[PDB]
């Protein structure tokens, strides 16, 4: 809990980021910074840092747990909880306010390793084949 | 405690280059699917 992370997309290659006009927005490789590119997770909504904690070398121990455990993503910066739109398939938008709704807990589901290399060779080929058609059109 | 390897551990290996006097850690990658070589 608390720990430092980046979230990339598999598919698209692009890392979750906060743009300086307070909105979620998936940008580059080659800009991601710590800054704008660093979530965390939290047990619960309160507002006590975790604080600075000595980084362990190993496993450590099993904390986060799939599936039942009760997530909440914070970016490290700004303290803006993530949360949604509510406005209105959905399409309901994404946003970080700072003290977003209830019902802001994301729970997670492993992906499988079959799914995990499928959307990883989707991503892989789907640059060469754009690579391919841009050299086509020169 | 020092920790030792052993078999079915996963890591990476790293090198250090030194261009014009700055380090950079190398890291050994490859994209074992439509490019079999490996680079840094």
Redesign the interface.
């Known amino acids: 809990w608390g720990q430092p992370f980046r979230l990339r997309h598999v598919t698209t290659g692009k890392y979750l980021s906060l743009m300086e006009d307070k909105n979620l927005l998936l940008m580059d490789k080659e800009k991601a910074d710590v800054k704008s590119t660093a979530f965390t997770f939290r047990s619960s909504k309160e507002k006590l840092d975790v604080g600075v904690r000595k980084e362990v070398?190993?496993m450590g121990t099993s904390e986060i747990k799939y599936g039942d455990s009760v997530c909440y993503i914070q970016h490290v910066d700004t303290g803006l909880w993530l949360t949604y739109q509510s406005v209105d398939s959905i399409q309901r938008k994404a946003i970080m306010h700072h003290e977003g709704h209830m019902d802001d807990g994301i729970s997670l589901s492993r992906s499988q390793h079959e799914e995990s290399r499928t959307a990883?060779?989707i991503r892989?080929?789907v640059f060469?084949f754009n690579r391919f058609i841009r050299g086509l059109d020169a | 405690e020092i920790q030792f390897l052993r078999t079915d551990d996963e890591v990476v290996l790293q090198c250090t280059a030194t261009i014009h006097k700055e380090q950079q850690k190398l890291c050994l990658a490859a994209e074992g699917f439509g490019n079999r070589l490996c680079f840094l």
Do not use: E
């Open positions: 070398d190993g990883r060779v892989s080929t060469l």
